Design a protein around this ligand. Structure first.
Ligand code: CA
Ligand code: MG
Lengths: 109, 138, 108, 192
């Protein structure tokens, strides 16, 4: 949210760009989240290519269908609310909820 | 609700289909998939499953219920309504001062649930009704 | 343009603009509202949401005649209305009135 | 002889194993409807549901949800199945539905609420409004598989027979699904 802390996503994408891999083996990067936090941290992520931003919530099934989650190479889940939430069992709110949401997703082929 | 939800699992869906107006699980699946309601084009198939019983209230002061409501019993009016208009009376919306001899200016009414056959009826009573539907009233 | 749900037991219409259905003091003055439903919301910027969709959903059940539908008007402080409007911009016959329900002029 | 208590956390699998949840008929979760922050209570109930489903996924969950947007989170749980009986009673949703039904017909909210509440049979000596109200309220809604003698008739006919002979009032049946006040054309069948 607006009061959430930063993460430092540069090191998340930096090793994917290592040159000992073929260029055709690179992977597109898409981020899904509430636009306030994205516009807060975008000052450190405006210099990278193949980086898509999607406003909304990862708990929404329509957003994940739009991203084509079933076709992605890999999905990772990160929560900036891991610091503002006082109760230890509740700091894994959105990570667990979204993991179970994607696991329960049904796809048609 | 919990106890009622436990001893009969279909109570919650009955409440949702009698209160929200027929919340079918297809609509719930669509809402869970989209997290919202979106537009769509018309389909002729949406005109055959809409015939149900609507809940409302009807007055016994006038109409064909007045003759049986002027000092009559609840059971006779309920039976006649069920026979004729496919009615179903499950309660009486009776004015608080209707049973009082002194005529007051009060308007608010209370609810008596499932009155007996020999229950005395007051002409100024309202009853709860379940009715049919017609698709060519628009 | 979606007037019936997938099952076909509900009423609905096309989405409308925020200012398309908002009635001001004068706009409510000329527009006569009779046989409608008034809903008085209290709240502020820090107030929590309610989820008013289920308040209007059963009024749109299709087992009722279309001419028996009721207009819906909400009265409240415009901050809370603009906060929750993101979930109420898709429904018809929904009027928003800024102000306070404790004001007699608004209720008139 | 009817109630036992045990101390433990729902998030702890050992406490869930102590109460023999694997053999429990259902699990009921209650929420603090008067919390200062509804989101925090909704989230705590969400993780209570998550923990109980993690221990036993096939257990039946009946839980209260303060908000509809937090209720929609439960539908994303793989173990959350509506067919099994996972009932998320949404207090806001049901209260708004009752308010709307009162808008359609005033006084229906109390009529519905008194049906779900178990009430005794109380009489008042003096003739007041409370006497008639308590006479009415003492009626609850029950469900029962009907007799085979009724088979071969119509629903209004069975309603009249039950009201006149058995002093019983029917509102809905099952047709060989829940059908609320079916028309005269529908016919009752075996196992109704
Ligand atoms: Ca009783
Ligand atoms: Mg014992």
């Amino acid at each position: 949210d607006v009061s959430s802390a930063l993460i430092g996503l540069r090191n998340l994408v930096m090793p994917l760009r290592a040159s000992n891999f073929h260029y055709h083996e690179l992977k597109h990067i898409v981020f899904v989240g509430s636009i306030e936090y994205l516009k807060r941290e975008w000052e450190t992520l405006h210099n990278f290519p193949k980086v898509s931003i999607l406003p909304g919530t990862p708990l929404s099934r329509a957003d994940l269908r739009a991203v084509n989650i079933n076709l992605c190479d890999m999905c990772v889940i990160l929560s900036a609310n891991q610091n503002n939430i006082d109760d230890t069992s509740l700091q894994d709110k959105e990570c667990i909820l979204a993991s179970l949401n994607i696991k329960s997703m049904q796809f048609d082929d | 609700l919990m106890s009622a939800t436990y001893f009969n699992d279909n109570i919650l869906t009955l409440i949702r289909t009698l209160v929200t107006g027929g919340a079918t699980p297809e609509l719930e699946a669509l809402i869970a998939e989209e997290n919202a309601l979106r537009g769509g084009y018309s389909t002729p198939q949406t005109l055959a499953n809409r015939d149900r019983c609507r809940v409302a209230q009807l007055a016994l002061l006038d109409g064909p219920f007045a003759d049986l409501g002027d000092g009559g019993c609840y059971g006779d009016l309920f039976c006649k309504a069920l026979k004729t208009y496919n009615m179903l009376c499950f309660g009486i919306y009776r004015l608080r001062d209707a049973h009082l001899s002194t005529p007051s200016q009060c308007t608010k009414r209370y609810v008596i649930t499932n009155p007996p056959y020999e229950f005395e009826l007051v002409p100024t009573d309202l009853i709860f009704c379940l009715m049919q539907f017609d698709h060519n009233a628009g | 343009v979606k007037k019936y749900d997938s099952t076909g037991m509900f009423h609905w219409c096309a989405p409308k603009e925020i200012e398309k259905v908002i009635l001001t003091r004068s706009e409510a003055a000329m527009t006569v509202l009779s046989g409608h439903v008034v809903v008085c919301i209290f709240g502020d910027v820090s107030s929590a949401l309610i989820g008013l969709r289920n308040l209007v959903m059963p009024l749109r059940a299709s087992n009722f005649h279309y001419h028996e539908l009721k207009h819906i008007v909400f009265v409240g402080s415009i901050e809370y209305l603009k906060r929750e409007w993101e979930t109420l911009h898709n429904f018809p016959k929904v009027s928003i009135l800024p102000g306070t329900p404790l004001s007699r002029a608004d209720l008139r | 002889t009817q109630v036992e208590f045990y101390q433990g956390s729902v998030l702890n699998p050992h406490d869930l194993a102590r109460v023999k949840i694997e053999s429990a008929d259902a699990c009921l979760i209650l929420a603090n409807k008067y919390c200062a922050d509804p989101d925090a209570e909704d989230a705590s109930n969400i993780m209570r549901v998550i923990s109980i489903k993690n221990y036993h996924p096939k257990i039946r969950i009946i839980t209260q949800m303060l908000q509809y947007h937090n209720k929609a989170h439960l539908l994303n749980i793989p173990s959350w199945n509506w067919k099994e009986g996972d009932d998320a009673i949404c207090l806001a949703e049901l209260k708004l539905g009752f308010i709307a039904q009162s808008c359609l017909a005033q006084g229906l909210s109390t009529m519905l609420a008194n049906l779900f509440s178990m009430r005794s049979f109380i009489k008042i000596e003096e003739d007041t409004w409370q006497k008639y109200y308590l006479e009415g309220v003492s009626n609850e809604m029950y469900t029962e598989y009907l007799s085979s003698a009724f088979v071969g008739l119509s629903f209004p006919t069975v309603c009249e027979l039950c009201f006149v002979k058995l002093k019983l009032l029917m509102i809905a049946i099952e047709y060989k699904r829940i059908l609320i006040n079916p028309g005269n054309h529908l016919k009752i069948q075996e196992g109704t």
